[PDB]
Write an enzyme that holds these catalytic residues in place. Structure first.
Site, PDB file in Angstrom:
ATOM      1  N   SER A 166       7.802  -5.661   4.153  1.00  0.00           N
ATOM      2  CA  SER A 166       7.812  -7.046   3.625  1.00  0.00           C
ATOM      3  C   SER A 166       8.015  -7.991   4.813  1.00  0.00           C
ATOM      4  CB  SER A 166       8.723  -7.144   2.399  1.00  0.00           C
ATOM      5  OG  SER A 166      10.121  -6.867   2.634  1.00  0.00           O
ATOM      6  N   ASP A 261      -0.103  -3.800  -6.577  1.00  0.00           N
ATOM      7  CA  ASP A 261       0.268  -5.132  -7.123  1.00  0.00           C
ATOM      8  C   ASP A 261      -0.570  -6.187  -6.393  1.00  0.00           C
ATOM      9  OD1 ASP A 261       1.675  -5.983  -4.804  1.00  0.00           O
ATOM     10  OD2 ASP A 261       3.662  -5.498  -5.634  1.00  0.00           O
TER      11      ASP A 261
END
Lengths: 316, 316
Positions: A166, A261
């Protein structure tokens, strides 16, 4: 009492400048020969502003050669968690146990107390501190107060890897661009890097969910409020008009990992740009049917798979 | 939601076994060459259960001999704070800066999660880990994963000191009794110990304040619920009928320090017993007109005096 910024359940900022992180996982102290994994860890000073958690797996007398070094930059918003807290510490512990690597998990300064580019400078400082072990033996410790015996005795600087998830993956990207522009101490090179779910903002051809168009972009504004060009700043949008050439990445091997996602559509645009860039290196891609958080825990099948994939990459 | 033990503002225990410490000072990460003091510190693993913060002052090329080693056991109830949190860390940093000592501040397990005698065993484990550096050089680090270069290169095991405040002072007492019964590794000896405001329960001839008769006694019941003899257990009442002989303390020099509050009447009974015991050693006494918390900060005149008194003791 008074609140100026509210992001439940992660972070609240008060008028008086106080920052509350109620969701953050607990501190885990140093430990020798963890019963579950055999791993040991220790928190070391790198500068007045930067520290790291170093990890040593259980090593057998038969395993006679120095280990790969895995330098980790944690994620969670540029604004949450710690190398010393359970979430990232437990994950790095498992990667070190599976890989048989010397780990170095960087405690960089968080936003909003220390806006970017503080995290980027702190992770560069930590990687240079790793590289500074080049050619040292134990006699160096007589006069160098900051050097780590676990790296001197058990870490192979010819097998130096980065990792990040991330925003930590974003930090890996920015550190790799800097490594192409500025040699590390003693000619040390980054052999490879693992970018899991890297935090990038690239314009998709079709509008995504409100979460992607609003919440996901908001972390950059919190992390770097004065960023020139906002969400098109090259440090967050690696395909911005003025962005540094991806061909300039200062490593030879990359593993880029995605889950199923909406971030996958942005990572695919990054991978398309990297493949077209004339970066000279080996690109491997993990593409998983999973939830982002699942890959951090070997208690999940996909987590076991991902930790093994990371080990196989570092040990290739 | 449900509360089983309530001690505002320090500690709350929930039915579900959760422990909340809302008053505890903030974590302070490792730092190299602190701008204010020049001190550096690092958190090292000693066992799966025990760790310590090690401190190195700024050393000049001219200052050619190894430094005294100061092993600290923090106080605060047997149930609060940390070697890694601001209150005790800042104090130890200042003692190390003034003294020019290698510091070792022990992170022992707290009650009620780990009742006594856990703290006593953990502080013994940490002192034995310090002693285990005897005769080592830097080459030892090839095969000993747990040894600390700052002790090997900068710590003189002929100049080994203990320190503790409040329950930490109680831990110093119990460790000194054990050191008289069990030699440390390699014949290492404790040269001296500093007991500031030691936590003892001895019956005064006159009833004291309700705080002394109730609250002050309550910490022992929280710390050691099953203690044989309760508040007359020899580990808290050093003049109990069955108590180990103070003559058996395993050190040659003591500094015992008191402030002008009701605990002074109990410390005076301890000092009377120590003086009558035939302990063979030099006893020095600090007796200050001050509040207990004042002596931890050099921002107070009495704190500056106390930190200098500690330095003069360790350096004698």
């Amino acid at each position: 009492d008074e609140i100026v910024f509210d992001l439940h359940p992660y972070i609240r900022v008060f008028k008086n400048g106080k920052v509350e992180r109620l969701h953050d996982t607990p501190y885990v102290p140093p430990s020798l020969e963890d019963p579950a994994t055999g791993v040991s860890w220790k928190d070391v000073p790198i500068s007045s502003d930067v520290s790291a958690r170093v990890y040593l797996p259980k090593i057998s007398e038969a395993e006679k050669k120095k280990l790969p070094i895995f330098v980790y930059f944690h994620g969670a918003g540029f604004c949450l968690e710690s190398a010393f807290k359970s979430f990232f510490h437990t994950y790095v512990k498992h990667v070190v146990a599976e890989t048989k690597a010397v780990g170095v998990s960087v405690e960089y300064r968080l936003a909003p107390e220390h806006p970017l580019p503080a995290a980027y400078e702190d992770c560069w400082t930590a990687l240079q501190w790793v590289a500074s072990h080049v050619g040292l033996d134990n006699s160096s410790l007589k006069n160098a107060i900051d050097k780590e015996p676990w790296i001197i005795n058990h870490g192979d600087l010819n097998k130096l890897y980065l990792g990040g998830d991330s925003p930590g993956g974003n930090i890996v990207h920015n550190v790799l661009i800097r490594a192409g522009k500025e040699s590390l101490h003693g000619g040390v090179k980054i052999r490879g890097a693992i970018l899991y779910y890297p935090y990038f903002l690239i314009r998709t051809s079709k509008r995504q969910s409100d979460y992607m168009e609003i919440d996901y972009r908001g972390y950059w504004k919190l992390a770097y409020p004065s960023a020139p060009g906002g969400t098109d700043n090259p440090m967050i949008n690696p395909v911005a008009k003025n962005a540094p050439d991806l061909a300039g990445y200062g490593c030879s091997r990359l593993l880029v990992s995605m889950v199923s996602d909406e971030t996958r559509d942005i990572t695919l645009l990054y991978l398309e740009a990297l493949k077209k860039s004339g970066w000279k290196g080996e690109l491997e891609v993990g593409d998983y049917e999973a939830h982002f958080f699942d890959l951090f825990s070997p208690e999940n099948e996909v987590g076991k798979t991902w930790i093994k994939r990371s080990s196989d990459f570092i040990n290739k």
